[PDB]
Protein backbone atom coordinates (compact mmCIF):
# COMPACT_ATOMS: atom_id res chain seq x y z
CA UNK A 1 0.00 0.00 0.00
CA UNK A 2 3.07 2.24 -0.40
CA UNK A 3 2.04 4.11 -3.57
CA UNK A 4 -1.47 4.62 -2.09
CA UNK A 5 -0.54 6.22 1.27
CA UNK A 6 2.01 8.34 -0.62
CA UNK A 7 -0.80 9.62 -2.84
CA UNK A 8 -3.03 10.22 0.23
CA UNK A 9 -0.44 12.48 1.85
CA UNK A 10 -0.10 14.24 -1.48
CA UNK A 11 -3.87 14.88 -1.67
CA UNK A 12 -3.86 16.30 1.86
CA UNK A 13 -0.89 18.64 1.28
CA UNK A 14 -2.65 19.83 -1.91
CA UNK A 15 -5.86 20.46 -0.03
CA UNK A 16 -4.05 22.43 2.68
CA UNK A 17 -2.09 24.46 0.12
CA UNK A 18 -5.31 25.34 -1.73
CA UNK A 19 -6.90 26.70 1.43
CA UNK A 20 -3.75 28.64 2.34
CA UNK A 21 -3.77 30.18 -1.13
CA UNK A 22 -7.42 31.19 -0.83
CA UNK A 23 -6.69 32.97 2.50
CA UNK A 24 -3.74 34.87 1.03
CA UNK A 25 -5.78 35.86 -2.03
CA UNK A 26 -8.46 37.35 0.26
CA UNK A 27 -5.91 39.18 2.43
CA UNK A 28 -4.31 40.64 -0.71
CA UNK A 29 -7.74 41.67 -2.01
CA UNK A 30 -8.46 43.41 1.31
CA UNK A 31 -5.09 45.15 1.20
CA UNK A 32 -5.58 46.30 -2.40
CA UNK A 33 -9.14 47.52 -1.83
CA UNK A 34 -8.01 49.61 1.22
CA UNK A 35 -5.07 51.08 -0.74
CA UNK A 36 -7.47 52.13 -3.52
CA UNK A 37 -10.09 53.45 -1.15
CA UNK A 38 -7.61 55.46 0.98
CA UNK A 39 -5.92 56.94 -2.09
CA UNK A 40 -9.21 57.91 -3.74
CA UNK A 41 -10.52 59.48 -0.55
CA UNK A 42 -7.32 61.45 -0.22
CA UNK A 43 -7.54 62.67 -3.82
CA UNK A 44 -11.18 63.83 -3.32
CA UNK A 45 -10.12 65.76 -0.21
CA UNK A 46 -7.31 67.29 -2.28
CA UNK A 47 -9.74 68.18 -5.08
CA UNK A 48 -12.24 69.80 -2.71
CA UNK A 49 -9.57 71.97 -1.07
CA UNK A 50 -7.66 72.84 -4.26
CA UNK A 51 -3.88 72.57 -3.89
CA UNK B 1 -7.18 44.39 -14.61
CA UNK B 2 -6.33 43.28 -11.09
CA UNK B 3 -9.90 42.47 -10.13
CA UNK B 4 -10.33 39.76 -12.75
CA UNK B 5 -6.86 38.38 -11.74
CA UNK B 6 -7.61 37.83 -8.07
CA UNK B 7 -11.01 36.38 -8.97
CA UNK B 8 -9.41 33.91 -11.36
CA UNK B 9 -6.98 32.86 -8.61
CA UNK B 10 -9.93 32.44 -6.22
CA UNK B 11 -11.58 30.16 -8.70
CA UNK B 12 -8.39 28.21 -9.17
CA UNK B 13 -7.88 27.77 -5.41
CA UNK B 14 -11.46 26.53 -4.89
CA UNK B 15 -11.27 24.00 -7.72
CA UNK B 16 -7.81 22.79 -6.53
CA UNK B 17 -9.37 22.19 -3.13
CA UNK B 18 -12.17 20.16 -4.73
CA UNK B 19 -9.85 18.13 -6.92
CA UNK B 20 -7.62 17.31 -3.96
CA UNK B 21 -10.69 15.85 -2.21
CA UNK B 22 -11.70 13.84 -5.30
CA UNK B 23 -8.14 12.55 -5.51
CA UNK B 24 -8.39 11.24 -1.95
CA UNK B 25 -11.65 9.46 -2.74
CA UNK B 26 -10.02 7.86 -5.83
CA UNK B 27 -7.12 6.66 -3.67
CA UNK B 28 -9.58 5.03 -1.22
CA UNK B 29 -11.16 3.31 -4.22
CA UNK B 30 -7.80 1.86 -5.28
CA UNK B 31 -7.10 0.92 -1.68
CA UNK B 32 -10.28 -1.19 -1.71
CA UNK B 33 -9.17 -2.87 -4.94
CA UNK B 34 -5.69 -3.65 -3.62
CA UNK B 35 -7.03 -5.08 -0.39
CA UNK B 36 -9.49 -7.30 -2.23
CA UNK B 37 -6.83 -8.48 -4.67
CA UNK B 38 -4.82 -9.55 -1.63
CA UNK B 39 -7.83 -11.21 0.05
CA UNK B 40 -8.68 -13.15 -3.11
CA UNK B 41 -5.10 -14.31 -3.76
CA UNK B 42 -4.39 -15.30 -0.16
CA UNK B 43 -7.69 -17.12 0.22
CA UNK B 44 -7.13 -19.03 -3.01
CA UNK B 45 -3.64 -20.00 -1.81
CA UNK B 46 -5.24 -21.64 1.22
CA UNK B 47 -7.75 -23.43 -0.95
CA UNK B 48 -4.83 -24.97 -2.87
CA UNK B 49 -2.87 -25.80 0.30
CA UNK B 50 -5.86 -27.32 1.99
CA UNK B 51 -6.78 -29.52 -1.00
CA UNK B 52 -3.49 -30.35 -2.74
CA UNK B 53 -2.66 -31.77 0.67
Author numbering:
A (entry chain A): 5 to 55
B (entry chain B): 3 to 55
Quoted passage from the original study:
The helices are about 75 Å long and have 13–14 helical turns. The structure is clearly a natural dimer; it is not a consequence of crystal packing. The total buried surface area on the two monomers comprising the dimer is 2,595 Å2, or about 15% of the total surface area (18,355 Å2) of the dimer (program PISA; CCP4). On one monomer (A), on the amino-terminal half, there is a near-continuous stack of hydrophobic side chains. These are Leu11-Phe14-Leu18-gap-Leu25-Ileu29, with a gap between Leu18 and Leu25. On the other monomer, closely opposed to the stack on monomer A, is a different stack of hydrophobic side chains from the carboxy-terminal half of molecule B. This stack is Leu53-Val49-Phe46-Trp41-Phe42-Met38-Leu34. The two opposing hydrophobic stacks are not only in direct contact, but are further consolidated by the intercalation of part of the side chain of Trp41 into the gap of the opposite stack between Leu18 and Leu25. In the less hydrated (34% solvent) Monocl-1 crystals, and the even less hydrated (25% solvent) Monocl-2 crystals, dimers are so closely packed, molecule A against B of translationally related dimers, that the sheet or band is extremely dense.
Apolipoprotein C-1 (APOC1) is a 57 amino acid polypeptide of Mr = 6.6 kDa that is synthesized predominantly in the liver of mammals. In humans, the plasma concentration is about 6 mg/dl. APOC1 had long been known to be a crucial player in the transfer of lipids between particles and the general clearance of lipids, but its mechanism and the manner by which it bound to lipoprotein particles was poorly understood. It was then discovered that APOC1 is a potent inhibitor of cholesteryl ester transferase protein (CETP), which is the crucial enzyme in the transfer of cholesterol between lipid surfaces (tissues) and lipid particles.
